[PDB]
Amino acid sequence: LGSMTQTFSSKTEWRVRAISAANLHLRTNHIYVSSDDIKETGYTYILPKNVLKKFICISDLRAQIAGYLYGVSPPDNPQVKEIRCIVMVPQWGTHQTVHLPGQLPQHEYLKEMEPLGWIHTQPNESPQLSPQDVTTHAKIMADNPSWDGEKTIIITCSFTPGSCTLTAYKLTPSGYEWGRQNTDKGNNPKGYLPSHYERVQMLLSDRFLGFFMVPAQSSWNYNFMGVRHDPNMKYELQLANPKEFYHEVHRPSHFLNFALL
Amino acid sequence: LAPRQVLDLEDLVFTQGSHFMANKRCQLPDGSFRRQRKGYEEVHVPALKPKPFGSEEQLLPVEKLPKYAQAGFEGFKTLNRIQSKLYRAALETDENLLLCAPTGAGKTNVALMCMLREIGKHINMDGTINVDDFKIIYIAPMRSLVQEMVGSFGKRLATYGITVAELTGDHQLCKEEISATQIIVCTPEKWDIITRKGGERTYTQLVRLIILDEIHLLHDDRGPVLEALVARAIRNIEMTQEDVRLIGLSATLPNYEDVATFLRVDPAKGLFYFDNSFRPVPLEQTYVGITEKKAIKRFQIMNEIVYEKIMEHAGKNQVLVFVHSRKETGKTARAIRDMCLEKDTLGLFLREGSASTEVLRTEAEQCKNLELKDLLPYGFAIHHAGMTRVDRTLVEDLFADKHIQVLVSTATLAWGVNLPAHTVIIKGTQVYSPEKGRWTELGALDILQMLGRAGRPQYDTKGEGILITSHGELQYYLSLLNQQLPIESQMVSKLPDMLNAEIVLGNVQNAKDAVNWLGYAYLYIRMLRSPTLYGISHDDLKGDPLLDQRRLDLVHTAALMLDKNNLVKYDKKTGNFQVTELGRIASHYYITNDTVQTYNQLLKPTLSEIELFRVFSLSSEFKNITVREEEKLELQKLLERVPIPVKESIEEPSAKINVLLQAFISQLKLEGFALMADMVYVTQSAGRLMRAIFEIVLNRGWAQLTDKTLNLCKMIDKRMWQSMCPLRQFRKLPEEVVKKIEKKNFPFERLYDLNHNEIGELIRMPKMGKTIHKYVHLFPKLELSVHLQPITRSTLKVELTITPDFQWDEKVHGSSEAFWILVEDVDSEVILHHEYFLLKAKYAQDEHLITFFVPVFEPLPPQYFIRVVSDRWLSCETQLPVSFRHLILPEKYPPPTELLDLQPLPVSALRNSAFESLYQDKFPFFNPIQTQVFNTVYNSDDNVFVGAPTGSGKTICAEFAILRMLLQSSEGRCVYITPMEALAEQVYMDWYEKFQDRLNKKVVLLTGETSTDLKLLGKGNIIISTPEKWDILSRRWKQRKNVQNINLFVVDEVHLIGGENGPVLEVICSRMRYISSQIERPIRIVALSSSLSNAKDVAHWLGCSATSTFNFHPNVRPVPLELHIQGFNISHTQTRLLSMAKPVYHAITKHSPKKPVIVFVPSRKQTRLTAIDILTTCAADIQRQRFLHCTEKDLIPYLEKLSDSTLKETLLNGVGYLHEGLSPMERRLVEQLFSSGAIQVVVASRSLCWGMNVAAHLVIIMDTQYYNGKIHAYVDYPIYDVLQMVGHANRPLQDDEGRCVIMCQGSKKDFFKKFLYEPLPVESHLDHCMHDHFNAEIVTKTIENKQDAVDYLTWTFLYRRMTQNPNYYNLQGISHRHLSDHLSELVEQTLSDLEQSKCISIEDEMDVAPLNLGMIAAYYYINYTTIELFSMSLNAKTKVRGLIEIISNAAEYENIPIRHHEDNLLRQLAQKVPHKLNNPKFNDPHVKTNLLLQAHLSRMQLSAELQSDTEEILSKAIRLIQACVDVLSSNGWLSPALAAMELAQMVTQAMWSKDSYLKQLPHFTSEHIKRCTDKGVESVFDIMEMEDEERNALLQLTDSQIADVARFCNRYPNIELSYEVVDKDSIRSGGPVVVLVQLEREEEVTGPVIAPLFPQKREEGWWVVIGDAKSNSLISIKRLTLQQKAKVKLDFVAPATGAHNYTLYFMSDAYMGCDQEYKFSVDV
Ligand SMILES: O=S(=O)(NC(=S)S)c1ccccc1
């Protein structure tokens, strides 16, 4: 066509995702926790509000993030398990699964608390535990025997409309075996079945406070530099608070590159 | 006042800027003419017209000028005509002046004359100048001008020693030069921001001369700044009564009379008007006004006319063209050169084959500029900002060499340097102003300066100026350049902001204050002269001829504007303004009100960096910034890849500003020139705006936003991001090496501990790695350890130890580095505390101890956090976790002892006559606390503890035990210890009048003098003493039988064990328990205190039974206590005080309308200022004199004896103030008036809360912080001071209530509540203060081994608290081995510090013994570090002046200084007093001490506060000089000990060693001793030799004077000395010899030493010293008193078979001239 006005003007996807994540602090006051009320397991998990609010404030809607859970039991009640620390480790995520290092957290503070599992974000509130989540939990269980199947949970924080719904799951032995055997990453893969997991009781509380531990050398968001992430990488931890998702330290290239031209 | 009407200020603004043409026509000078040429109209003005001379004008040679100022005018002889006219008014009068002279003409030389006048004022006799005493302010309109002004003023005034410099950059820390500078040249806005922040003890006080250059800027839009400054200066002169001189400089413009009225310039004396005739060279004027309305054709036509004019000057001297931009200089030079090349006209500029063209070709390679080498050879040149200063100077030099024939320049050259040219052409008068968002016409000042640069000093007979512009604006540029442009005010535009500036200053606080303020403005003057131009109807002016209603309406509109934007809380009825933090921040960072309202609305704690960038982008300074089409493509290309996202479309200028800022931080070059200009604007403004957002979000305690804003400030400054390797911040490091470093992703962190070669291998460029290492270690970094001190289960005290872990290079770090300390909660949302930390070079290596209070709660929060962030260095951040895993929290407070509803106890329960008599004279029933505790104190012998609020009557409880002791034995001894001496005197008066006057018992107040006090303890039944006076005595409890025979020990305000002096209280109180255990005769102990949460600990410490300890609660106070805490959140202290001003009046009229009121203020100045504020608010809101209750004439007698007229007036209105500087009679009279109820309100300094004897219904505490001149920083009121201040609200027999309002910072509210509503925990600090006690106990053999030292520590309160709150003393465990190990470490450290200090000796690392230094320490009650410095410094060196220096620098005197720059004045006279040496470290305590001491020796008259300082210094002085004598005698030489004795007597009689002894005689003037020396007689007892008739004939004195003199002549010691050697001839070289000296007083009078100039009372003392002056060896020393007669023997080991003299024994400790010497000799 003769002389027609043509020029493409567009922006990258992470721009829109950052402008979206800037308002994540809103979903924190409307946080709902799902209870089928038929679980009656016995093992009850209490999640403090502060670490959950910082977990949500630093996440992304599309790309998933995860944190390890460490906690002990209250003085008198063995049946109760109070999540008391969230360990953020260098990770890189997609909307289905999160890629984490093979090294479990190791530090002095965590020596007194039990590894209670892991927590991760989820863009869609699927009514079942993801096959990727089952596989990741079972592989973490097999490589590290610190996670007993009965005392470790998968907490899923689903990005419901204008809110965030929590639900907690524990793996059953058949789920452990299937997750150790799975090398398929399909959304409905081989040998996946709802009897592979079971629902455990999660509780939100503001009675006690929990703390974060973040890696001491680099931060946790390797999503913007997914190359540097190898599963055999090894990290040291420190007592600090996790940076937001789009903090300048997480994406140094976006600044340096823009500077060179 | 009412009713008012709101104005539209927008409509009232001319909206013409400085282009307002108030003149209606324009006449032209005869001879001028107008032509029309090629579509542009040309106007021609002849100028010329220099009147030869007036009536009689003769130029003044500099020889006729005053001598002092001739040297500054070096290199000149004949002043110009204007200068010769103004020499009188500039150097011989102090009048304020306004000079309207044509531009050029050296109008700055008259300013130099005025400066030389003010410089000559402060010239002293030495030839030097009191440079510290005065400061001069020069106000130049352009920084360009300011730099040249600083340079030339320094050059001409270096001969007098003035450091002339301008102040630049951040004013937060660059203040050293500020004190150093004597002349400050600066732009008006910089002076405005300075005076806005202001403060006390500022240098603005010493500013005496202000010079406003180019004051016609009043017409400019910057004019309102000049208006604000002059109004402020006049108002502040009125308030200070200290006149300041104003010197205004303007051009030949109309309205000059109104400008003189503005500057308070008298028309006859001060006003000097000269026209354009007095221009140096005649200015042939050509004005070109074009009519072509096509832009392309306008460009071509303007170039064509410029070319025509330059070719008309082809062979003429020079051509100087001025254009708007930097690139346009190149464009215009290229255009004219190319048009010369199209013709053959170029060859006319060149002098054929020139040597000058050879020079231009010589600097073709030397110019190293892309445009310069292309345009320099043809005679063309350009001058612009983006050019090397060396290149610019070279262009200037070639123009001065006359080589450069055409120069095109931006206005920066026109303002900066002195570069005249014959012909000057202005190529266009329109320029892009990024603020306006448009191209606007040129500011009249720029035009006036450029066209004043036309013509030359001597090179040209005449100059010619051509001005090319639009035809419409022609007239304007005509009337400006031919004196028809009036000067008008543009303040209406900026009025709200200006008003806030004055509200924040407190200068304005009501609407009428603002009407006055506006009356001092040029706007008011111009409205009064031409109401038509400012929109005031003529009948409207008739309505109020002074324009009161119009001014008040303007003020009402501005106040409504500021209240809308939430800067200022405005009350419509009252007209009152209450400053808010937002308003202060706006004034203090040059932010307009709309911008601040934007910040307040948008800024939330949950903002992201995206949103923060947008918030900055929405600033009202950028409102006229617009996105134009010509740039949208480039802006879209940027916004497509910006690091910080931008949500809006590119059409919105918010996006333009956001993108421009991001590009500035990323250091990007933009193609559009409008983009470059708008970026310059946005970014230069961005700094202050982001700092303002920083203070907002920080003082709001938002952690995340605070971090982001600080980092954005650092990024805007350093032009980088966080991700960039911070090494680039050095500016000495190459860019490419940092690029190669950035490629490597090894964290810069990870190259800290690495060595040089490994660094080099990592970079892959190894050789230079060392440099990197240097610049790696120069990068600032700190190391933080934390000591957690649990105060209560809810409050934690934290001691942070900051240790610098970098190397300090002054090339990099400067004089100081700055950090921010931020304590952050668990989730890093809330800043629990923030603090500014300045690492100075003085302590760049040393540790830094910062202590603060943070709340806590149960269950314990996991951690807190402590971040330390460099204020300017990027990524320089060090963070420390604070874990509570191992926090040991104290037990909860036990329930207080119940106050039972018991029957009030009558006085008849004492069952004794005189007891009953006194306490029925005073009341019929006992205080309920007294009633509850009566039986245990009166009818038992047990130790007892009482805890109750201050003002409960604890003194009567102690009197009970005193009475029981007197009943058990009428000769018994009680010792009452109270921590404050000013309270000890209250106790002494009351208890003498009681016990001694009504019982024939003894009440003695100890003095600190050892023998006096021992007598007083021997003769007394009730011995009152401060803690130290009892420590020094009770230490020798083995050698003092009186100390052991004590029966009762009472101690008041025992909670003060937790204060600064706490240790000595704890020590004496444990000493009494140890003594009572040792003697087996029980010493009863009675303790009174305030309510203690841990009272049981102290009770057990004192052996008080559980049944004997009584601890109450502040609700049991006899007078019921109403407490109100009011939070004021302004961080800036001074503004917080201003904000608290009016609520003081409110609290008075609410809580105590009729009853008396005491206000406590942080400083002495605040006393008077708060009194004045009370009176002003009272006059305005209701009616003054509600405070006065006695008739004014009944008080005029009492009143007229007072010194301060301010005090007598405020007293007349009913308000009196108390401060340290008030003489004792004045304070007594004010307190008498207060107790009498004649005056209602007393405003009192904080320091008097112990000294005050009065009381009131209401107590209003202001601020609770005071400035320290030592640290130069604010310190908090300790809780004990607050408790006592509140205890002042105890009026028992008059008020049913007691009300107290504490006005504090919001953050402290909780803490104060927490610790004022409930009993207070106290703990021991003895673990720090311990070395002197240990040394003394090693002296008195109370402690013999280290195990004995731990034994000693068992008796203390420290032991009781260590098992109850271990972390407070850095313990970790309550077990017995932990305690033994902690005490082991402490004892070893204290004893080793003693041993190394040489006070004690450790044998076998086990047993300790006392050395002589420790003995001199414990004997004279002196700190051991003083003794160590003494031992090291004295040696055999003897200097009286050096001795004064050594004594001064003793560690005891580390107290007193505040403000007092008058030490400088003393320093000047200290330049006179024998010792001026050492660098003048004013504000240093020891400096002040020896300064005051040497003033005292010369009987110098000083201030009253200085006299109190002198008193304390003198007491501790004599004790120190005795210590020095004992040191110099123990092993020193003879001359220094003798000189120290001479110094003792010099101090006693305030005599210098050179002064005549007759200066000791009372009522003896200097003329009297001159008469006596005219007789030659100087002997002190020679006066005693003359007959009383003869001495009366010579003296000519009054009988009372002669009586004082006779008492002194009798008291003067004359003694008979006899020297004797036992077995003299039969002595042995190896054996010892004893010399016997017998001394007998002939007179034998009893009494003290007569020294009125000495503070305390002192007795005679004497020294005896064997030692030869030939060898300077002291042999045998002994000191002794000479009551009656006495024999003394001196033992000394004989020398070896050699003749020796019998030396110079006799020496005094008080009277001067009583010194004797007897000599003799015998061999062995
Ligand atoms: O002992 S304190 O720590 N004072 C100093 S900083 S010497 C303290 C503690 C509580 C209240 C006021 C004062």
Coordinates of N, CA, C and O in Angstrom, one line a residue, chain A residues 8-12 14-15 18-19 22-23 25 50-51 54 108-109 112 207-211 216-217 228 239-241 244 246-249 251-252 254-259 261, chain B residues 606 608-611 636 638-647 662-663 666 668 704 707-708 715 721-724 742 745 749-750 826-828 857 859 862-863 865 881 883 885:
Chain A
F8 N 6.0 -0.1 14.3 CA 5.6 -0.8 15.5 C 6.2 -0.2 16.7 O 7.4 0.0 16.9
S9 N 5.3 0.1 17.7 CA 5.6 0.6 19.0 C 5.0 -0.3 20.1 O 3.8 -0.4 20.2
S10 N 5.9 -1.0 20.8 CA 5.4 -2.0 21.8 C 6.4 -2.0 23.0 O 7.6 -1.6 22.8
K11 N 6.0 -2.5 24.1 CA 6.9 -2.7 25.3 C 7.0 -4.2 25.6 O 6.2 -5.0 25.2
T12 N 8.0 -4.5 26.5 CA 8.2 -5.9 26.9 C 7.1 -6.3 27.9 O 6.4 -5.4 28.5
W14 N 7.4 -7.9 30.8 CA 7.8 -7.7 32.2 C 7.5 -6.2 32.6 O 7.3 -6.0 33.8
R15 N 7.4 -5.3 31.7 CA 6.9 -4.0 32.0 C 5.5 -4.0 32.6 O 5.2 -3.6 33.7
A18 N 5.3 -5.7 35.9 CA 5.8 -4.9 37.0 C 4.8 -3.9 37.4 O 4.5 -3.7 38.6
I19 N 4.2 -3.2 36.5 CA 3.1 -2.3 36.8 C 2.0 -3.0 37.5 O 1.3 -2.4 38.4
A22 N 3.1 -3.9 41.3 CA 3.2 -2.8 42.2 C 2.0 -2.7 43.2 O 2.1 -2.1 44.2
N23 N 0.8 -3.3 42.8 CA -0.4 -3.2 43.6 C -0.7 -4.5 44.3 O -1.8 -4.8 44.7
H25 N 0.3 -5.4 47.3 CA 0.1 -5.1 48.7 C -1.4 -5.0 49.0 O -1.8 -5.1 50.2
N50 N 2.6 -12.1 59.0 CA 3.7 -11.2 58.5 C 4.5 -11.8 57.4 O 4.7 -11.1 56.3
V51 N 5.0 -13.0 57.6 CA 5.8 -13.6 56.5 C 4.9 -13.9 55.3 O 5.4 -13.8 54.2
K54 N 4.7 -10.6 53.4 CA 5.9 -10.3 52.7 C 6.1 -11.3 51.5 O 6.7 -10.9 50.5
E108 N 22.6 -22.0 61.1 CA 22.6 -22.3 62.5 C 21.2 -22.1 63.1 O 20.7 -23.0 63.8
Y109 N 20.5 -21.0 62.8 CA 19.1 -20.7 63.3 C 18.2 -21.9 62.9 O 17.4 -22.4 63.8
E112 N 17.5 -25.6 65.0 CA 16.5 -25.9 66.0 C 15.1 -26.1 65.5 O 14.3 -26.7 66.2
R207 N -0.8 -13.9 66.2 CA -0.4 -14.0 67.6 C 1.1 -13.9 67.7 O 1.6 -13.2 68.6
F208 N 1.8 -14.7 66.9 CA 3.3 -14.7 66.9 C 3.8 -14.2 65.6 O 3.0 -14.1 64.6
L209 N 5.1 -13.9 65.5 CA 5.7 -13.3 64.3 C 6.7 -14.3 63.7 O 7.4 -14.9 64.5
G210 N 6.8 -14.4 62.4 CA 7.8 -15.2 61.8 C 8.8 -14.3 61.0 O 8.6 -13.1 60.8
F211 N 10.0 -14.9 60.7 CA 11.1 -14.2 60.1 C 11.5 -14.9 58.8 O 11.3 -16.1 58.6
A216 N 22.8 -15.1 51.4 CA 23.7 -14.0 51.9 C 24.5 -13.3 50.8 O 24.8 -12.1 50.8
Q217 N 24.8 -14.1 49.7 CA 25.6 -13.5 48.6 C 24.7 -12.8 47.5 O 24.8 -11.6 47.3
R228 N 22.1 -17.9 35.1 CA 23.0 -18.1 36.2 C 22.5 -19.2 37.1 O 23.2 -19.6 38.1
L239 N 20.2 -13.7 58.0 CA 19.0 -13.2 58.6 C 18.7 -11.8 58.0 O 19.4 -10.9 58.3
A240 N 17.7 -11.7 57.1 CA 17.4 -10.5 56.4 C 15.9 -10.6 55.9 O 15.2 -11.6 56.2
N241 N 15.5 -9.6 55.2 CA 14.2 -9.6 54.6 C 14.2 -9.6 53.1 O 15.1 -9.0 52.5
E244 N 11.7 -7.0 47.0 CA 10.6 -7.1 46.1 C 10.9 -7.8 44.8 O 12.1 -8.1 44.6
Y246 N 10.7 -6.9 41.6 CA 11.3 -6.1 40.5 C 12.4 -5.2 41.1 O 12.6 -4.1 40.5
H247 N 13.0 -5.5 42.2 CA 14.1 -4.7 42.8 C 15.2 -4.6 41.8 O 15.5 -5.6 41.1
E248 N 15.9 -3.5 41.8 CA 16.9 -3.2 40.8 C 18.0 -4.3 40.9 O 18.7 -4.6 39.9
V249 N 18.3 -4.8 42.1 CA 19.3 -5.9 42.2 C 18.9 -7.2 41.5 O 19.8 -8.0 41.2
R251 N 17.5 -7.3 38.5 CA 17.5 -7.1 37.1 C 18.6 -6.1 36.7 O 18.2 -5.1 36.0
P252 N 19.8 -6.3 37.0 CA 20.8 -5.3 36.7 C 21.0 -5.0 35.2 O 21.4 -3.9 34.8
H254 N 18.6 -4.7 32.9 CA 17.7 -3.7 32.4 C 18.2 -2.3 32.7 O 17.7 -1.3 32.0
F255 N 19.1 -2.0 33.6 CA 19.7 -0.7 33.8 C 20.9 -0.5 33.0 O 21.1 0.5 32.3
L256 N 21.8 -1.5 33.1 CA 23.1 -1.4 32.4 C 22.9 -1.2 30.9 O 23.4 -0.3 30.2
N257 N 22.1 -2.1 30.3 CA 21.8 -2.1 28.8 C 21.2 -0.7 28.4 O 21.7 -0.1 27.5
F258 N 20.2 -0.3 29.1 CA 19.6 1.0 28.9 C 20.6 2.1 29.0 O 20.5 3.1 28.3
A259 N 21.7 1.9 29.8 CA 22.7 2.9 29.9 C 23.6 2.9 28.7 O 24.1 4.0 28.3
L261 N 23.3 2.6 25.5 CA 22.9 3.4 24.3 C 22.1 4.6 24.6 O 22.4 5.7 24.3
Chain B
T606 N 3.4 2.2 50.8 CA 3.4 1.0 49.9 C 3.8 1.4 48.4 O 3.5 0.7 47.5
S608 N 5.9 2.0 45.0 CA 7.0 1.4 44.3 C 7.8 2.5 43.7 O 7.5 3.7 43.7
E609 N 9.0 2.1 43.2 CA 9.9 3.0 42.5 C 9.2 3.7 41.3 O 9.4 4.9 41.0
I610 N 8.4 2.9 40.6 CA 7.6 3.4 39.5 C 6.7 4.6 39.9 O 6.8 5.7 39.4
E611 N 5.9 4.3 41.0 CA 5.0 5.3 41.5 C 5.8 6.5 42.1 O 5.3 7.7 42.0
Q636 N 9.3 8.3 22.7 CA 8.8 6.9 22.6 C 9.9 5.9 22.5 O 9.8 4.8 23.0
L638 N 12.8 6.1 23.9 CA 13.3 6.0 25.3 C 12.3 5.2 26.2 O 12.7 4.2 26.8
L639 N 11.0 5.6 26.2 CA 10.0 5.0 27.1 C 9.9 3.5 26.7 O 9.4 2.7 27.6
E640 N 10.3 3.1 25.5 CA 10.2 1.6 25.2 C 11.2 0.8 25.9 O 10.9 -0.5 26.0
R641 N 12.2 1.3 26.5 CA 13.2 0.5 27.2 C 13.7 1.1 28.5 O 14.8 0.8 29.0
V642 N 12.9 2.0 29.1 CA 13.2 2.6 30.4 C 13.3 1.6 31.5 O 12.5 0.6 31.5
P643 N 14.2 1.7 32.4 CA 14.3 0.7 33.5 C 13.2 0.7 34.4 O 12.5 -0.3 34.7
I644 N 12.9 1.9 34.9 CA 11.7 2.2 35.8 C 10.5 2.3 34.9 O 10.4 3.3 34.1
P645 N 9.5 1.4 35.0 CA 8.3 1.5 34.1 C 7.6 2.9 34.2 O 7.7 3.6 35.2
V646 N 7.0 3.2 33.1 CA 6.2 4.5 32.9 C 4.8 4.1 32.4 O 4.7 3.6 31.3
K647 N 3.8 4.3 33.2 CA 2.5 3.7 32.8 C 1.7 4.6 31.8 O 1.2 4.0 30.8
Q662 N 14.9 9.5 34.3 CA 15.5 8.2 34.2 C 16.7 8.3 33.2 O 17.8 7.7 33.5
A663 N 16.6 9.1 32.2 CA 17.7 9.3 31.2 C 18.9 10.0 31.8 O 20.0 9.7 31.5
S666 N 20.7 7.5 33.9 CA 21.4 6.6 33.0 C 22.5 7.3 32.2 O 23.2 6.6 31.4
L668 N 22.3 9.6 29.5 CA 22.0 9.5 28.1 C 22.0 10.9 27.4 O 21.6 11.9 28.1
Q704 N 10.6 1.2 53.6 CA 10.8 0.9 52.2 C 10.9 2.2 51.4 O 11.8 2.4 50.6
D707 N 14.1 4.0 52.1 CA 15.2 3.4 51.4 C 15.2 3.9 49.9 O 16.2 4.4 49.4
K708 N 14.1 3.7 49.2 CA 14.0 4.0 47.8 C 14.3 5.5 47.6 O 15.0 5.8 46.6
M715 N 21.3 8.5 43.5 CA 21.4 8.2 42.1 C 21.4 9.5 41.3 O 22.1 9.7 40.3
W721 N 23.2 4.2 38.6 CA 22.2 3.4 39.3 C 22.9 2.5 40.4 O 24.1 2.6 40.6
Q722 N 22.1 1.7 41.0 CA 22.6 0.8 42.0 C 23.5 -0.3 41.4 O 24.5 -0.7 41.9
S723 N 23.0 -0.9 40.3 CA 23.7 -2.0 39.7 C 25.1 -1.7 39.2 O 25.9 -2.6 39.1
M724 N 25.4 -0.5 38.9 CA 26.7 -0.1 38.5 C 27.7 -0.3 39.6 O 27.4 0.1 40.7
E742 N 32.9 -4.5 35.5 CA 31.4 -4.8 35.4 C 31.1 -6.0 34.7 O 30.2 -6.8 35.0
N745 N 31.0 -10.7 36.9 CA 29.9 -10.7 37.8 C 30.2 -11.1 39.2 O 29.3 -11.2 40.1
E749 N 31.6 -6.8 46.8 CA 31.7 -7.4 48.1 C 32.9 -8.4 48.2 O 33.7 -8.4 49.1
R750 N 32.9 -9.3 47.2 CA 33.8 -10.5 47.1 C 35.3 -10.1 46.8 O 36.1 -11.0 46.8
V826 N 10.5 -6.0 62.7 CA 10.7 -7.3 62.1 C 10.5 -7.4 60.6 O 11.4 -7.8 59.9
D827 N 9.4 -6.9 60.1 CA 9.1 -7.0 58.7 C 9.6 -5.8 57.9 O 9.1 -5.6 56.8
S828 N 10.4 -4.9 58.5 CA 11.1 -3.8 57.8 C 10.0 -2.8 57.2 O 10.2 -2.3 56.1
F857 N 7.9 -6.2 72.9 CA 6.6 -6.8 73.4 C 6.7 -8.3 73.5 O 7.7 -8.9 73.1
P859 N 4.7 -12.1 73.1 CA 5.9 -12.8 72.9 C 6.9 -12.0 72.1 O 6.6 -11.1 71.3
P862 N 11.0 -11.7 66.7 CA 12.2 -12.5 66.4 C 13.4 -11.6 66.3 O 14.4 -11.8 67.1
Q863 N 13.5 -10.6 65.5 CA 14.6 -9.7 65.4 C 14.2 -8.3 65.1 O 13.0 -8.0 64.6
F865 N 16.4 -4.7 63.3 CA 17.5 -4.5 62.4 C 18.0 -3.1 62.5 O 17.3 -2.2 62.8
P881 N 21.7 -7.4 62.0 CA 20.5 -8.0 62.6 C 20.6 -7.8 64.1 O 21.7 -7.5 64.7
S883 N 19.0 -10.1 67.1 CA 18.2 -11.2 67.4 C 17.8 -11.2 68.9 O 18.7 -10.8 69.7
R885 N 16.9 -14.1 70.4 CA 16.9 -15.5 70.8 C 17.3 -15.7 72.3 O 16.8 -16.5 73.0

